[PDB]
């Protein structure tokens, strides 16, 4: 059973993890040499490089799953790596599903697991965990406003101008364009007002709404992170009870 | 009598409220989803279900008054809602005027109080409702500066550019475009600087005013919230 001991030692090794991280970085840096248009002599180079990296990472994932069978299916990272290697093999056998092997360039994300011990990273990740509920409320509320306004926009402007409003599945896209303040007058409403001369009753209040919500979002953060820190000296007023 | 107590027991069933909410999600969902190549055979059935759901909805809104006689009227909620009930039932036997039937979606605002039911959503809705009036004062204040700048704009750029400064009912719109920082340079100002070479003196201080409305707005919110 000493080979299981060998796998437990040599697989669980800092040199092994460091080697596999430098190999993933070399995957990325070889993958990012592509330029178009191509002489096609590079193309048979690039396919072979994809093949070699895919096979080496398959040998990697097999050796990583050999050491335990049920301790797997536990972290999302290993399942995610299994999905990546699986999609790459599906591209490797079957014909042109090109552009579905392009998910593979996310494994550089694994570099984050190297830098847990950095003291500077801890402040920004504690910042990023301290924002989440406000954003996750704002997303649902703004989604409800979109679902209210989009159906009304489809019924109003639907017969004429179909390219921008002819279904729900594009009315969403046009209202997401108009929210972030790009070309909403010169490329949207100025052709609308030539045909429907009362279109400015619809788009002008809408802008107010989303703009209002966004400013509140920012200042909500600016009071909330301000609100807890004062509490961190309020207990010292308890320390000032004796004084 | 006792049947009054019975109808109070029936109308407080929240399963009926969830049913009518999902039902009217579906009711709004119908005529939206239609492909504009219109087959007009199931569109007839869409009009039928339109009639049916408005009828069931009217049965609800008149069945409401048997429980609450006056206390239903006191609520500011279910008032604009009742008004849009009436404006929805206008459509059934009247002439073809649109722009009134299409308001039938708005009562998805009913689930706003479902938003009130969530304890996590308690914070931000109260944060909005407590802060509306200090924003309303600022809205009136900058409406006055739009009205003072539009009249000044029309008399300088009315001749020779009638298409987007020719009258007040369009000068207001063009200057609202210029406030929100969209395409003011390549679309508005530089085609004017080939005729009146001192035009920027009127437009660059304008952005120094209505864009630095945004700074005291934050002060009003931060003092309030």
């Amino acid at each position, epitope marked *: 059973s000493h080979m299981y001991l060998r796998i437990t030692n040599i697989v669980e090794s800092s040199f092994f993890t460091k080697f596999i991280i430098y190999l993933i970085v070399l995957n990325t840096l070889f993958m990012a040499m592509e330029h178009h248009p191509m002489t096609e002599e590079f193309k048979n180079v690039l396919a072979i490089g994809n093949l070699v990296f895919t096979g080496i990472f398959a040998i990697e994932i097999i050796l990583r799953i050999y050491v335990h069978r049920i301790s797997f299916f536990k972290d999302p990272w290993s399942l995610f790596d299994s999905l990546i290697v699986t999609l790459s093999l599906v591209e490797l056998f079957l014909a042109d599903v090109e552009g579905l092997s392009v998910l593979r360039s996310f494994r550089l994300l694994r570099v984050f697991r190297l830098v847990t011990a950095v003291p500077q990273m801890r402040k920004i990740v504690s910042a990023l965990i301290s924002v989440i509920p406000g954003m996750l409320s704002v997303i649902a509320l703004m989604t409800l406003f979109f679902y209210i306004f989009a159906i009304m926009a489809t019924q109003l402007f639907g*017969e*004429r*101008f179909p*390219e921008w409003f*002819g279904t729900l599945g594009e009315s969403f896209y046009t209202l997401f364009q108009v929210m972030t303040l790009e070309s909403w007058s010169m490329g949207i409403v100025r*052709p609308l007002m*030539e045909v429907y001369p009362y279109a400015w009753v619809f788009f002008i209040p809408f802008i107010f709404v989303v703009t209002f919500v966004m400013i509140n979002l920012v200042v909500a953060i600016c009071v909330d992170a301000m609100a807890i820190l004062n509490q961190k000296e309020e207990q010292h007023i308890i320390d000032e009870v004796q004084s | 009598s006792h049947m009054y107590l019975r109808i109070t027991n029936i109308v407080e069933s929240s399963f009926f409220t969830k049913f009518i909410i999902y039902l009217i999600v579906l009711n709004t969902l119908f005529m939206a989803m239609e492909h*504009h*190549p*219109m087959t007009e055979e199931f569109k007839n059935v869409l009009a039928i279900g339109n009639l049916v759901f408005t009828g069931i909805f009217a049965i609800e809104i008149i069945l409401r008054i048997y429980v609450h006689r006056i206390s239903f009227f006191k609520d500011p909620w279910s008032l604009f809602d009742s008004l849009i009930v009436t404006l929805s039932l206008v459509e059934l036997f009247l002439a073809d005027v649109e722009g009134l039937s299409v308001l039938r979606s708005f009562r998805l605002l009913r689930v706003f109080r479902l938003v009130t039911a969530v304890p996590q959503m308690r914070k931000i809705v109260s944060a909005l409702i407590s802060v509306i009036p200090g924003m309303l004062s600022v809205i009136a204040l900058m409406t006055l500066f739009f009205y003072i700048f539009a009249i000044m704009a029309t008399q300088l750029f009315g001749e020779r550019f009638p298409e987007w400064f020719g009258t007040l009912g369009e000068s207001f719109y063009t200057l609202f475009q210029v406030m929100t920082l969209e395409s003011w340079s390549m679309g508005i100002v530089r085609p004017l600087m080939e005729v009146y070479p001192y035009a920027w003196v009127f437009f660059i201080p304008f952005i120094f005013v209505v864009t630095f409305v945004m700074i005291n707005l934050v002060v009003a919110i931060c003092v309030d919230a």
Partner: antibody
Amino acid sequence: EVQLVESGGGLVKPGGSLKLSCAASGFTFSNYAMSWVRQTPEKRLEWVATISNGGRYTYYPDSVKGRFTISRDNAKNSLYLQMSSLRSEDTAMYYCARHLYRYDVGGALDYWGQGTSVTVSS
Amino acid sequence: EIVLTQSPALMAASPGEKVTITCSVSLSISSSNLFWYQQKSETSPKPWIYGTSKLASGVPVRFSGSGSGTSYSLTISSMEAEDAATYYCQQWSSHSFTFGGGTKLEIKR
């Protein structure tokens, strides 16, 4: 210059096909809709087809449904009308036409072509 | 569907005359979408009146049209030397165009 050229044309036996091509010249072609309108030799018009700016939305009348096909290509500024399985009552003069307001279907028709004749006889 | 009705079939006139031609339809239709067209001999027809109140570009200022509801009309103030043509009234609908039947002028002599 703003012009329209309308190629093809001629005589086809009843049951054949023909593919017509309109090429526009001068305006920004990727910002209008376009439409085909025919005329009988008895001096009467009859709408045939239209298409939006992009190429994803088409429209047809009842009487030719599922038989005529319209297509665009912006990168060569060209308009294709592909036909099949003609009838006797289609011996007509065809016209390529531009709509009036930008980005719009279903308005006026401000600028036409010059007609191409298609005849069905055995 | 939305179908038209023209009147008269034919009409002939002497120059220097204020004549009137009509167009009608089987349903009430708004006045912002209704157009006119003019056709000479061997000419692809040209846009002539937009929106039943306005002339097109290059049109002489002697023509006008008016009406509403299900009744629309054109008025010629003084008939000229080149105004023997055939006229059309156009209407837009649910998703399908619709043309009239043509009305033709002649010079009496």
